[PDB]
Design an enzyme around this catalytic site. Structure first.
Site, short mmCIF file in Angstrom:
data_model
loop_
_atom_site.label_atom_id
_atom_site.label_comp_id
_atom_site.label_asym_id
_atom_site.label_seq_id
_atom_site.Cartn_x
_atom_site.Cartn_y
_atom_site.Cartn_z
N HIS A 93 41.64 27.64 36.18
CA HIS A 93 41.49 28.35 37.52
C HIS A 93 40.32 29.15 37.87
O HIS A 93 39.71 29.36 38.86
CB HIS A 93 42.67 29.63 37.79
N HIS A 134 35.33 37.33 35.24
CA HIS A 134 35.45 35.81 35.98
C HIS A 134 35.11 36.18 37.22
O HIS A 134 35.03 37.41 37.95
CB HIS A 134 36.88 35.46 35.68
N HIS A 181 34.93 39.69 39.08
CA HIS A 181 36.00 40.55 38.69
C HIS A 181 35.76 41.12 37.33
O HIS A 181 35.87 40.02 36.23
CB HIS A 181 37.19 40.09 38.91
N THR A 192 45.25 39.15 41.38
CA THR A 192 45.00 38.15 42.47
C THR A 192 45.45 36.78 42.05
O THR A 192 45.15 35.83 42.88
CB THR A 192 43.58 38.15 43.22
N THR A 193 45.97 36.27 41.04
CA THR A 193 46.46 35.14 40.47
C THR A 193 47.65 35.59 39.87
O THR A 193 48.07 36.59 39.51
CB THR A 193 45.49 34.38 39.36
ZN LIG Z 1 39.88 37.69 39.93
#
Ligand SMILES: [Zn+2]
EC number: 4.2.1.1
Length: 258
Positions: free
Chosen positions: A62, A92, A117, A196-197
């Protein structure tokens, strides 16, 4: 059929496996700069990265995570809106297929080419796994990327990416200094939100810097050569790995600056 960013498994689908996707404090959000109120009780952010110890860089299917040794108080975020000390575990990025999109947070609906982030966990919960179960368990520092001049401090990251092209690949990545990724100013917006994932846990104090950093078109081009798939699978470029803005739901975004 795992979550991802495609037509059949992308952000609009996540709520089926992760019902908190439609919850009360989801991230990212649009930052309406005209309604984010200046809060003079907010403190300067304290970013202490001089002793940071990076270990490894991983393609997790991801994004890529640059991971840090968080077994001692070496690279901590504190101050700002935070109480207590948060330890850096990984950073990341999210980025687009085009320079005109890629960021998760937006600023008066403007999308940046990418967003960094830096993920930290509250040391009073002992480790990251226990921290994400707490409403104040994480502090995530978000930094926008625009395409312009190269960021020299990003180049060691860009150059190892060919070694972790596909999902599951990792590479030794020691002595990377994340201070090379920070803008001049630490002025920020802050609001309570989520990962956010998936699992989208509502455990994050978001701290989003007002000042973007510039990276070159060549640097962001190399992000876009990464793969969502694993080795020996059909090639799917890892681009547009960003979740869109989610409803604010009356949360207030506060500005550290006038
Ligand atoms: Zn992130």
């Amino acid at each position: 059929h795992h979550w991802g960013y495609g037509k059949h498994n992308g952000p609009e689908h996540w709520h089926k496996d992760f019902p908190i996707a439609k919850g009360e404090r989801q991230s990212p959000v649009d930052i309406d700069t005209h309604t984010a109120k200046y809060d003079p009780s907010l403190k300067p952010l304290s970013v202490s990265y001089d002793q940071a110890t990076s270990l490894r860089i991983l393609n997790n299917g991801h994004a890529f995570n640059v991971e840090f040794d968080d077994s001692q108080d070496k690279a901590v975020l504190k101050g700002g809106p935070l109480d207590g000390t948060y330890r850096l575990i990984q950073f990341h990025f999210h980025w687009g297929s085009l320079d005109g999109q890629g960021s998760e947070h937006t600023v008066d609906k403007k999308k940046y080419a990418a967003e960094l982030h830096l993920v930290h966990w509250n040391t009073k919960y002992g480790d990251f796994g226990k921290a994400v179960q707490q409403p104040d368990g994480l502090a995530v520092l978000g930094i926008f990327l625009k395409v312009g001049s190269a960021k020299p401090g990003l180049q060691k990251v860009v150059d190892v990416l060919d070694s972790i092209k596909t999902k599951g690949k990792s590479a030794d990545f020691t002595n990377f200094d994340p201070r090379g990724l920070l803008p001049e100013s630490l002025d920020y917006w802050t609001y309570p939100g989520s990962l956010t994932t998936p699992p989208l846990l509502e455990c994050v104090t978001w701290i989003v810097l007002k000042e973007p950093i510039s990276v070159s078109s060549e640097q962001v081009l190399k992000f876009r050569k990464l793969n969502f798939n694993g080795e020996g699978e059909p090639e799917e470029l890892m681009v547009d790995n960003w979740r869109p803005a989610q409803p604010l739901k009356n949360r207030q975004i506060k500005a550290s600056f006038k």
